[PDB]
RNA sequence: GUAAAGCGCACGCAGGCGGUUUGUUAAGUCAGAUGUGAAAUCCCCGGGCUCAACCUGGGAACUGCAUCUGAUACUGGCAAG
RNA sequence: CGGCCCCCUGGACGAAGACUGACGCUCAGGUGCGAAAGCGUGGGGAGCAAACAGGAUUAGAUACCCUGGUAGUCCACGCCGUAAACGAUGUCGACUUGGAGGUUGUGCCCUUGAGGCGUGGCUUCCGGAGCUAACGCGUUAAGUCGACCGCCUGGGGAGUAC
């Protein structure tokens, strides 16, 4: 059964990048939306677009720089089987700071740097590079 | 723009599948291959033997136009099925024209009954007939000057199997294959059938309304085993064959050619 | 200007009607002390000829690597067939902490400071290939900025 | 430079069947007509123009062009095109490693040249018959193989090709060496190795001729420049 | 032997046998390195030519692309920074610093001729400051010529020539939309002022008629 | 899959995991504080034995536990969809 | 699991709608089904055939071959609980280029004809990216991921002893 929506998102994105798909669509969720927004802010994607009322569909638009994809790597870290929660000091650095780590915090979902700046940790969703 | 889309549907509108629209201009001749271009993906490897008329020499130079045939695409590279078959549609139209006035008038010269019925030839092709049609009455053209010139007056046609019998004389006078498969049966009714593919044990001449014949390898000639059918007859040619044997059950009519 | 290191040389056999024909394989690697690196794997009946071939092959099909000053830009993994390799940027003075063929390629590359372990197979040929792969895929800050449509200070 | 109507007339828009296509060509395909792929001329034209411009630029800097077609239908035409702009060509079977293994083939060229000289300039006749027949045969072989590229000297600076799938060896060689590739690529073909792809009917003769003629004209222009 | 087997593109050889022999060479980008092959192991082959016909200062330059890169390469072995251009006789105006000019110029009658044939034409070794000195000696002159072009009032002409790049000498063939951004552009009049300059050119041709 | 290693196949309790929206809670989670976490040991900056080991001042650390005050994105609970 | 018929009976798929409203996935123990051989009791017994007997072959022939031939194979009700019980590939879900078929639905289309254009289910082969020690797998993954379980830790001794 479908158990982890976010991870499914990330896999879809990965597969689109692999296959040189322009855009990747999937059912929408708020957490998914926020993640997409974070990615866009962090520039791994061009734009995201949710559409629909009863069952809305998130549609991300993937990014390709000099042929190859932008999202070099994208992994979940927290997962239903095994959750990961980090305190602000302990927060990670993806690719020695070049990549990002999406982290959900009390004040919303943000990149690891942003969280560090804020002064708070939380659940580590995914690494992106 | 939609320029191109409109053109695509235009060019759809100005071509059809069969060999109907005389469009291919002969753009290279060499012996033994003619080639055309009828607005298809590729040029046709035409034989010279589709295009010599009734005495054995060529008739069309560069720029000349005959339609070919279609509905089969790319055996690996190329485009067509041959154009004389197109001529068969014109012959069918001429034969149908009879219906209008109940009399199609051509020359028809029938010397001898291949399969009971005299063979009647229209300009290039020669078709085979059922017995009665050669003569309106018991006149029997065997006493007429050999290969005589009258006309063809249609007595009988099979309407799915191209067997057409016509009346040479007497100007004044004017599932489906397998249930009743007893027409060409009795022992030895000879037929005019185009061969389709030679499978190195066979030739597969099969013309008479969705049947299959095999003149396989043993007769074919008067040598038995060293023969290799491709050397000895043809590809795609109408020949002498007769039944010799019918299964109506396991649909194996085993024709012959040594006759 | 280019420096060249023959990593390994190995005798390989071919059985024939008479007996065993022996030959020699030479695995070399060359580099200019900067980003640029290239390995070559030559073969000949005699050793010196085989190493000569290895040098020739290495000299062509070289590959560039984006070095932050003496070390790498971030931890990087690279694999090839059995040899799976981890290598990690390190502070000036630490030197090349790496084993075997891997070491050699790093030195010619002109990296001076790395912490580096070869997991899995340590078959010199495969492991050097894996190293090269890890070095190639490694991208720089400017490169990622360009990829992502940002400035370097935005990425830090 | 080359108009769309002319290309349509030639039969560029036609492309291979629908069981023989390549999904990397899906962008370049427009539709499928009578179970035959149609190439999108709208997308073909601009890129063809581009490719022409690049070829011209190459010519301007005194670049060496190699014209490859071994389809044996358009071998004559590719040779003619090469000669019109006095460039080089391979109209018969491409020798495996002609470019990568140039140095060996360079000897081959030299032997051919020597044989030609013997034939023509020496005027020495008086050769043992069988030996003379053998030398003649060798000459014919080498002319067939390396006739166009004999005056080439070194390695071309660009590579025009009539079919990618058919000449993939040449393409691969060009990629290994890094020579720019200008390929006519039908729907069945693989355009990944190609730098300046050209979606067009490699098979049809008139289309091939058209492709060649425009290429030759732009080479001549660049030379004039 | 690479050069012999068409691997080292060698165009011209602007060298002065008996003194210095600097020459640039190009190559098909394929990990060849032209100068490197010409030099060898610690100038192995370089020493051969060095003591070949006689003690010569042979030099090799890594040809980049076109003639623009040939200019700097012709100034080697030294330190070029910039250069000017023109039409038929572009006259590569070498732009270096006094400190580096000592080696760049080397000898009054030696590197000034050896590097002159390098591009095939001729070079004019100058100084960084010299460039600027001559650079300004050009801005004032499309203005420094008694202003024989458009002409209207002078108080507006000063404010117009302040923002005006390369004065107005034949500037109508340039962008005729960036001067409208200037504070003060109602009906096409400045676009007309440039037309006046064009008329001034015709007037100059009429002056040629007055003299021819 | 072939190197050791997918139960012969199913159903299914306990257990593990759980679509989507809103509200609420605040258990998990995070932040801050307080209490404690003996001294010695380890580490940092110092000092004293001629140096060192050794001795030694101050810090940091002791990743934890308990409480109180917040945060509520996520996980959980409860209520409605 | 294979001749037809009838009776009782489980599942699958498609077509539209209508409803319920997360009721789901996986599963240690547990429970059930589980080829062939084998066991028990009672029936049956044509053919075949472990065992057995004779004839050959052979150095020997407790085999292969030949002639016979009993358990068994067949039925009923119990037990046994294992097989290279194999796709040597756990189950469920999602995503990622293609081609050629088979089978079984179903929508439209002049079925003008065996057809034309789609859209579902199951299924055979080839092959791309990717993966793989390679062989190969390749939208039915051995690719990219998530949930749960089972299992492995050098060869023998041993899947044996207690």
Swiss-Prot record, chain C:
Keywords noted in UniProt: Acetylation, Antibiotic resistance, Ribonucleoprotein, Ribosomal protein, RNA-binding, rRNA-binding
Gene Ontology MF terms in the entry: rRNA binding; structural constituent of ribosome
InterPro entries named among the record's database cross-references: Ribosomal_Su5_D2-typ_SF, Ribosomal_uS5, Ribosomal_uS5_bac-type, Ribosomal_uS5_C, Ribosomal_uS5_N, Ribosomal_uS5_N_CS, Ribsml_uS5_D2-typ_fold_subgr
SUPFAM superfamilies registered for this protein in UniProt: dsRNA-binding domain-like, Ribosomal protein S5 domain 2-like
Gene Ontology terms describing biological process: cytoplasmic translation; maintenance of translational fidelity; response to antibiotic; ribosomal small subunit assembly; translation
Family from the record: Belongs to the universal ribosomal protein uS5 family.
GO cellular component assignments: cytoplasm; cytosol; cytosolic small ribosomal subunit
Record gene name: rpsE
Function: With uS4 and uS12 plays an important role in translational accuracy. Many suppressors of streptomycin-dependent mutants of protein uS12 are found in this protein, some but not all of which decrease translational accuracy (ram, ribosomal ambiguity mutations). Located at the back of the 30S subunit body where it stabilizes the conformation of the head with respect to the body.
UniProt subunit comment: Part of the 30S ribosomal subunit. Contacts proteins uS4 and uS8. With proteins uS4 and uS5 encircles the mRNA as it enters the ribosome, which may play a role in mRNA helicase processivity. Can be cross-linked to mRNA. In collided ribosomes contacts ribosome rescue factor SmrB.
Signal peptide: none
Protein name: Small ribosomal subunit protein uS5
Note from the entry: Altered uS5 proteins have been identified in a number of mutants. Some mutations in uS5 have been shown to increase translational error frequencies. Some mutants in this protein can partially suppress an alanyl-tRNA synthetase mutant.
Domain S5 DRBM: 2-65
